[model samples]
Target: ALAKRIDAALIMKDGRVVKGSNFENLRDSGDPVELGKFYSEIGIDELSFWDITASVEKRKTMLELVEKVAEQIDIPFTVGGGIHDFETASELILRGADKVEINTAAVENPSLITQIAQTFGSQAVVVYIAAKRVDGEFMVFTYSGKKNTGILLRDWVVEVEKRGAGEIVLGSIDRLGTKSGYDTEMIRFVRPLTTLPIIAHRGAGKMEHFLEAFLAGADAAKADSVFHFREIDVRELKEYLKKHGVNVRL
Candidate 1:
């Protein structure tokens, strides 16, 4: 019933995708090499290895894991977490990551967005913004939703785009893991603000939710629970979207 999410299985040092799941660390030291290996075994070609706790803990990028995953994987991979500056972003790219994702650090120092874009080009940088509707206002949350920046949604999108961010991963905190649906309002809110592609995060309760996201203007849609639970198959979802007139790479 739900749409399948695509993650280029992360391989941590242990040579596994952390229990066959996208091992999201509650701590910063989680290993991507292990997750990458897991994906390799399962024959997955794309994976997203994110450092969920890196920014909150002020930790360094997991360079060791990045290199290890790169050494092992021959397919596409994206690395995220605790990326605050162009230096670390460059390191990830040099280490074989197709793109680097930044969140909290970008929110705190918006200039970094522009800097990364200028230095590495927009395609190398992916900025993630967690948005939630609180009492009718869309608010931006930083540090994995631990802190609220009170930045208006539309204005922030404009600022990030002006700085040259290549793409946006707009996550809905309230509906995350709740299986409600992609935040249509937030998608609509940021659609006209920038011409860059948007990756809708969280929500995505069902196949229809994915359709709604595209219909509402999102270029891509993402979910974790549905895929992890096998609620839908990626190939099936692709076919569904194609049938619905949503262009997708099957």
Candidate 2:
């Protein structure tokens, strides 16, 4: 059985950690490096660092900040945003990122998925999928939830797995920062389609939501505001999960 993971998402905008609702209307959270180190010391299973404006700004991710955060955190650290090719991905890995995540790039050039996976080994590639429920379909979005690709969620999941992605970070654009809970229905739908671990993102209001994510077949439960705002303590959440029979790294 795969042990469940607890993840804290750090959204960087203008080089500072921020949180948004429906992926916009950002508010300051804190310094990225400080929060990353805090989560690591507190026993959070992993850290996801996303430069939210990199793609929209058409610039490279902040390498210095990535390096700083990576230096402080002992747990797995994944960095994404504006990473379009193997060189950038390699640079991130070289700077201490355990994995490099791509969303807009992956959707624009699916082959980059295989290219990075082949070079870095599959475990180093994380494909971030940001999607919203459009009409009756879940369509993929990019540019930090600004552009719609009109791609079906399931189709992309299948393609990502076939292309050798190490894992999938599934974010619900509609549910982002709402904290109602994760879109477990989406988790259930995609879980059977790929062998890659699914890290459920976007909505996580209460501790039970984390459990619901695992029950729906997600390998990890990730939140942005809850952790950033200190609304939920990581240690207490893991303890609650353990009491409820969820396997977590304590």
Candidate 3:
């Protein structure tokens, strides 16, 4: 049996870890390198390091930070932001990242998904979809939720799956940092469309929310502020999920 993955997400901006609500009004959280090691030591299933402003700012990913953070943790580490092509993806993977997630880049050129997947294998590629309810439809947003691509969420999910993305990190722009809960309705909607694993992102204010995402068909659930702020301890959350009959690594 597979254990449900609980990922601790670190959002990086201007070299500092930050958290924000609905992708605005940001506040510094902690050092990314330190938080990465802390989460790993605390038994987090995976660590996700996202450079939140890299794409919009047109800067390369902070390779030095990636190298430093990768050195301290012995768990799966996924890096994203400013990853637009196979070369950048390879560079990050060479720097010790387990996977490279692409959002804005993938949306601009769908074939990049197949390119990276072919060289590094599909398991190395994660396509992140940032979506929010736009006029009764789930619309994809990019550039850290700043630009609305006008693409329907379901259509992009199908394209990425067909292009051989290893996983999908479905993030909700509506519930992000609100402590509301995951948009499980989005999970349920996309679950039937692809065989690839889906990692629910943003809006986990409580332990039960993680279980709710899993029950709604997310293979894994990611929490940012909840974990960063210590609102819910990862180990205790694991125990809680276990009691609720969800398979998890304690």
Candidate 4:
């Protein structure tokens, strides 16, 4: 069974782990590898660190950093960005990354998903979606939310599933770094679109938001600033949820 858990997310910009408000003006949080070890020790169920600038800069993910962090953290881990080809994904998997999150690369070549899934199994591929609501509808954004694909959100998620994606990381560009709350409507809307687990992301500002995502049918909720800034601690959050009758990994 899939464990009801929360993932601690880290965004790495040019080798430094940082958290930003709405993905802009990033400020350092800590060393990616070091922080990975810390969170792992603190009981982070799954740790995801994004090489945020890799795709925009057109280079591979920092595999050395990936290896170091993966070595330090025994939990299920994911690293992504600038993974446009077989070699990069292969390298990440070989270097200890449990999964690779793909965005621009998958959009540019949907066939890449098929290829990766064929070579590495669907479970190894995750599509990172940065979405923003536009004129009563949601549009998928890529290249660090600087470019709007204009593709409808539901349609894009369905396409990713058809292409053999295993899961999705749905983060809101509008709510990111706002420390407000998760977009439950987005989770409710997308969960039925695919059978794969939805990793609800972007906008976990408070403890109650965790309950909302689980109530909305999300399999997991991911937080960045909340954990990075100590807005809440991982163990305490899980305990609070457990006390509230929300199933969570302690």
- Please report, in order, the local distance difference test score of every candidate based on alpha carbons: 0.70, 0.84, 0.85, 0.82
TM-score of candidate 3 relative to the true fold: 0.90
Candidate 4, residues 7-95, lDDT tens digits: the string is 98787887777643332223333667777777778778988877766454424447777778776778988888678888888888888
Candidate 2, 57-135: lDDT as tens digits = 4344467777787777788889887788988888888878899989899999999999998878999999999988899
Q: Count the backbone clashes (under 3 Å) in each candidate.
A: 16, 0, 0, 0
Better of 3 and 4 by lDDT: 3
For candidate 4, the per-residue lDDT at 153 reads 93
Cα lDDT, model 1, residue 141: 91
lDDT of 3: 0.85
| Cα-based RMSD of candidate 2 | 4.2
* Runs with alpha carbons beyond 4 Å of true place in candidate 4: 19-29, 53-61
What lDDT is obtained when candidate 2 is compared to the true structure? 0.84
Q: On a 0 to 100 scale, what is the lDDT of residue 212 in model 2?
A: 92
Give the range of the ten consecutive residues with the poorest summed lDDT in model 1.
Answer: 8-17
Pairs that collide, model 4: none
RMSD of each: 5.4, 4.2, 4.2, 4.1
Per-prediction TM-score to the true structure, in the order listed: 0.80, 0.90, 0.90, 0.89
Top of the candidates by lDDT: 3
Question: What's model 2's TM-score?
Answer: 0.90
